[PDB]
């Protein structure tokens, strides 16, 4: 029983989910999003930093 890093709600123990370190996001609802511009990153290029993900180098630097 895990909590989503995107929406802070439970992820169903049975379903498949996005994982990076001790972070998990829902893979079906819009939770795996660029922390800056909210772009859905499922299947996309992404740049993880602790609990955040981008998108692009532009969104990343915007959050320095």
């Amino acid at each position: 029983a895990v909590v989503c890093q995107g929406c802070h709600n439970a992820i169903d123990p049975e379903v498949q989910r996005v994982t990076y370190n001790n972070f998990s996001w829902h893979a079906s609802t819009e939770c795996f999003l660029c922390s800056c511009c909210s772009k859905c990153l499922i299947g996309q290029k992404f740049m993880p930093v602790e609990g955040m993900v981008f998108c692009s180098v532009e969104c990343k630097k915007r959050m320095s």
Partner: protein
């Protein structure tokens, strides 16, 4: 004239708990991380949490800090507190953002409980 003092700047996705749908939801109605400050009015020694969306600077939280705010560090990256209306949540970008905000919150409460 003396503008309010920002005593911390953390990155968090600001959230509220939606009771009717028994889940957490984004504050202001949309996803995205915010820059979250504690502002200190040095004239009166009053404090508030102010959070502005990183993409467009939409204000999603503007919350006074009372003497005796119960600040709940629920997880290492998720902290929360309530008032009579809402439960506010901060989903930090990292443990460092969280610890930095919590220290500023305790400093605020230090001054408020003097």
């Amino acid at each position: 004239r003396m503008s309010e003092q920002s005593i911390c700047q953390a990155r968090a996705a600001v959230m509220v708990y939606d009771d009717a749908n028994k889940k957490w939801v984004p504050a202001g109605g949309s996803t995205g991380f915010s820059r979250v400050h504690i502002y200190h009015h040095t004239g009166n020694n009053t404090f508030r949490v102010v959070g502005r969306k990183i993409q467009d600077h939409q204000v999603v939280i503007n919350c006074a800090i009372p003497k005796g705010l119960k600040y709940n560090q629920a997880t290492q990256t998720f902290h929360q507190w309530r008032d009579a209306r809402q439960v506010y949540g901060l989903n930090f970008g990292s443990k460092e953002d969280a610890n930095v905000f919590a220290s500023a919150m305790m400093h605020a409460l230090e001054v408020l409980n003097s």
